[PDB]
Amino acid sequence: KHTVRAAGAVLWRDAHPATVEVAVIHRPRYDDWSLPKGKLDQGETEPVAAAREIHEETGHTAVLGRRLGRVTYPIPQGTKRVWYWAAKSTGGDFSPNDEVDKLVWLPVDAAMDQLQYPDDRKVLRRFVKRPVDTKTVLVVRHGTAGRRSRYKGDDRKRPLDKRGRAQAEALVAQLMAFGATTLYAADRVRCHQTIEPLAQELDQLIHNEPLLTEEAYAADHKAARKRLLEIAGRPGNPVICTQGKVIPGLIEWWCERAKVRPETTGNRKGSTWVLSLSDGELVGADYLSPPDE
Q1: Residues annotated in a binding site for Mg(2+)
Q2: Could you tell me which residue ranges the Nudix hydrolase domain spans?
Q3: What residue spans define the domains of the chain?
């Protein structure tokens, strides 16, 4: 591949003179003030790399929220692409070392003045444009599950294929990066199976959702919209695994109603839409590729 994948973050905490402060880090390797970031390690996806890099470079545990864009650079083979997220510090302490020897917590205008690079300042401008104390709803399309059957009951029970099972396993860490706590799935085997590894990891039962199947959609294009909103209103960060036809419409409906612009779009099997909410309203809709893409 000619693409080097990387991720970074604006790590923030609720503090004054600021209600939010962000971490700016000094890197001895380049004598610069920047944001935590790094290339993906083997088997990672971007959100996991972001969480890992936050902990490596700041000492802090964090939960990811809204995606904050991507920066690309030319490399000799091709292109290096860095995706960024807002991330709330949940614990830990900074300790200097030879990779990051200083960290400062600053209100966003002071952090803007501290950052050496226009790409990092751009990411910080994105951060400030919308709230970051967000609740997260994770809408997931089931993993690959072969071709459809002519018999409806058979089709509805179709399990994941080998690739889909690998996707389901790879989703665990990805979705945990966002602090997933509760699990819901359309009334189809493949939808439950996709999030069963996560259910195992969390020890959390998957709530079954007949209103979120295509069958239910074909009867009432919205009873489902209402169910997603009802799930979104519960405490905690839910994962909702559903079918392909249901997703674009739900996402487009919500983005239209809330005036939100997704930066990327897709509906691949095993993909994730990260929906960020601020006082019950959508402020971000971030499409993540399937973990093996």
Answers
A1: 37, 53, 57, 99
A2: 2-128
A3: 1-132, 133-293
